[PDB]
């Protein structure tokens, strides 16, 4: 029956599923200790699911609203809320926040059996580490000749509202819907998931370290919500509105809630939009339509920078206030201006798109077999493929990156070489030399003290080079362009310094 089974120890909690769904959460620690879906239990037995590594101590309370049950953990800084409806499969969560947990990060893992639940979706198995050696920290392996890591399950959140592990009797995806708390906008991804060989793991990454490109943010996080299946796949369309009738700490509801509605124009067409909005407290994004028009999802009130993208290249920023019960008209409007181009490499994106090896980085690590060699390689523009030109360069692996091309006596004037990134890495940098002209060497870009293009990320800061190219410089017939990453730091291979590429244009 729907209900709550109280004992010394535990709260058992059932859903009333149809094809059965109970936990059980100790009163001591919050943990999920045991998880039985159609009869079988899910929960690896050594340690349980919960927030970050386990709360340790929480005060725990459960209780029944109607058609709802709500069980709540109190500890000193979060206060943990997982809640059912009578019939559906589902651990709805939040998780309330007043400071970052001591670990510096903000997830909630799910560790299940791993023989019921073997697969990654949807990836695969690229995040299976189960059986391999580390290669990089303790984070990326080898799984006999192929390169893995928990890293390589990720996904930009704009695109991740659903990942599961599944079986071939049992499937448990997280939804999320709602990513307001988490940091680092629309194209942050994280870790969603690791069959790491004792259990899969199964996480939503509230917020963390992992190519952090923003302050984190308190309040309720979530609600996200894991549901279990049998065989079946279930939809993102989960509505989670009930919370506001459960007194959630830091839970706006719907009705205090505004919106932010309007057309954004004048980007590359060729490109997905994406419209942005995020102040200290709340984050939010939606794509527009191919006509440009766009309305956000329901926002907190405040006052919000407000970011018009094309791919991942912010090309205008404004600002908006939206109150609660009513929509603000706003539109965006800007465009990527260079000049007369003479040649281009990649688009401005704001991703390596296109480049060598990029479509596998984001699944495999850089030392795979399967990639491309990495260079030093030479670019002739009119000849080489954009799969010829490395997707990122390390001081210590393929510098410098060499670019020939061909030049009319027309465009023997001035000029500007423009060498768009997306991330760095230990200071990487370019300083680039075209004929016999180098440009200044410039500054140690802001350091994000984490590790990403060896982790299947590239979404940083996106500095932009510009070097000033005299006339006279650039010849008739053929040129040269060296690109070699400068840095005062070190590392082996692929964690020497480096940057990934978005676009080389060179324009008058
Ligand atoms: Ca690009």
């Known amino acids: 029956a729907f209900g709550i089974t109280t004992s010394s120890s535990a709260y058992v909690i059932d859903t009333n599923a149809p094809n059965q769904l109970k936990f059980t959460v100790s009163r001591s620690s919050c943990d999920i200790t045991s998880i039985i879906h159609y ?18 101590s929480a005060t725990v309370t459960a209780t029944q609203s109607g058609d709802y049950i709500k069980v709540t953990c109190v500890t000193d800084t979060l206060t943990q809320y997982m809640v059912v409806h009578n019939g559906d499969p589902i651990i709805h969560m939040a998780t309330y926040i007043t400071a970052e ?30 059986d391999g050696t580390a290669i990089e920290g303790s984070d990326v392996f080898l799984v006999g000749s192929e390169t893995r890591s928990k890293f390589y399950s990720s996904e930009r959140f704009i695109d991740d509202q659903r990942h599961c ?146 791919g991942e290249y912010a090309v205008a920023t404004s600002s908006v206030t939206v109150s609660a019960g009513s929509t603000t ?37 850089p030392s795979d077999s399967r990639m491309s060699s990495w260079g030093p390689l030479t670019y002739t523009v009119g000849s080489s493929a954009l799969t010829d030109f490395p997707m990122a360069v390390f001081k210590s692996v393929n510098n410098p990156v060499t670019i020939k091309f061909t030049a009319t006596s027309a465009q023997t004037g001035a000029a500007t070489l423009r060498i768009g990134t997306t991330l760095s890495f230990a200071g990487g940098r370019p300083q680039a030399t075209i004929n016999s002209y180098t440009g200044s060497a410039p500054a140690a870009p802001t350091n994000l003290d984490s590790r990403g293009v060896t982790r299947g990320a590239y979404r940083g800061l996106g500095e932009v080079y510009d070097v000033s190219i005299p006339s006279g410089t650039i010849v008739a017939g053929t040129n040269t362009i060296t690109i070699n990453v400068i840095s005062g730091s070190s590392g082996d291979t692929y964690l020497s310094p480096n940057f990934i590429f978005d676009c080389v244009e060179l324009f008058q």
């Open 39 to 56: 009869g079988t239990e899910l929960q690896y037995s050594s340690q349980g699911s919960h927030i970050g590594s386990g709360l340790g």
């Open 329 to 365: 008209t706003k539109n965006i409007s800007g465009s990527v201006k260079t000049g007369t181009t003479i040649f281009k490499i990649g688009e401005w994106d704001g991703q390596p798109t296109g480049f060598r090896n990029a479509a596998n980085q984001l699944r495999m690590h």
């Open 165 to 310: 592990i599944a079986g071939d009797a049992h499937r448990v995806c997280m939804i999320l819907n709602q990513y307001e708390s988490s940091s680092g906008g629309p194209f942050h991804r994280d870790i969603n998931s690791n069959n790491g060989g004792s259990y899969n793991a199964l996480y939503w990454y509230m917020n963390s370290g992992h190519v952090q490109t923003e302050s984190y943010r308190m309040g309720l996080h979530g609600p996200y919500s894991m549901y279990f299946s049998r065989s079946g796949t279930p939809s993102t369309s989960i509505d989670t509105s009930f919370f506001a009738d459960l007194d959630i700490k830091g839970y706006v509801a719907a009705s205090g809630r505004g919106k932010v509605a309007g057309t954004a124009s004048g980007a590359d067409s060729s490109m997905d939009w994406v419209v942005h909005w995020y102040n200290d407290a709340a984050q939010y994004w939606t794509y527009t339509s191919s006509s440009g028009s766009f309305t956000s999802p329901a926002m907190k009130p405040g006052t919000y920078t407000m970011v018009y993208y094309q």
């Open 101 to 130: 947990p001591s670990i510096g990060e903000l997830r909630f893992i799910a560790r299940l059996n791993s023989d019921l639940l073997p697969n990654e979706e949807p990836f695969g198995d690229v995040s299976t580490t189960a």
